[PDB]
């Protein structure tokens, strides 16, 4: 799961893969690696809620990788920001 520089280098499927890696590190004994993945998540998405999208998802959307991608897509689209790579 190579950490891309922009959300534009990520296909939706690739971002889902990044989320499952985060879910994997989320159950490790330490947060060292997890926190790096979370920081990257925050940087690329640029969503104002940052990692709350993962730990504190709105109840108006599914608490799952798909729900997180959807909320990111809608927020970035609504703000005229470049979205995921269609691939």
């Amino acid at each position: 799961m190579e950490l891309k520089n922009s959300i534009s280098d990520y296909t939706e499927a690739e971002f889902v893969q990044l989320l499952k890696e985060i879910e994997k590190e989320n159950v490790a004994a330490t947060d060292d690696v997890l926190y790096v993945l979370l920081e990257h998540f925050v940087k690329i998405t640029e969503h104002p809620d940052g990692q709350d999208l993962i730990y504190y998802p709105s109840d108006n959307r599914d608490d799952s990788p798909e729900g997180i991608v959807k909320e990111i897509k809608e927020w970035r689209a609504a703000n005229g920001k470049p979205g995921f790579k269609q691939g």
Binding site: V27, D31, D49, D52, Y55, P57, S64
Partner: protein, 127 residues
Amino acid sequence: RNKPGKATGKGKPVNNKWLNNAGKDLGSPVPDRIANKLRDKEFKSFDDFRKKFWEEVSKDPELSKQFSRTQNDRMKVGRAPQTRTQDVSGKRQSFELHHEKPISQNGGVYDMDNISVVTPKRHIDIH
């Protein structure tokens, strides 16, 4: 502190917003249902207690529902749930367990009635 001991206390009843008031004064108390699962149990260290504590939260049908799936996964493996970004402080990004009475003064390492859950910011402010 890092020595073994038995957990005690009754804790307090909580609603569907248990950690809502966690960056308050003394934060959220140990849920009574959680204290029953931990009462009279021997722990190697407070760390061992904290690990079991959060596991019990993930296992409690009423409390786990107040947390997202990823939050529940963390707690299941003994990790404290992550706080909302707004309540973090440096590397401290998860709820912390606080002893009303410090270990030195009166102590009470495994006294669940002396333990509460606070956000990293609250913990720094109370100190």
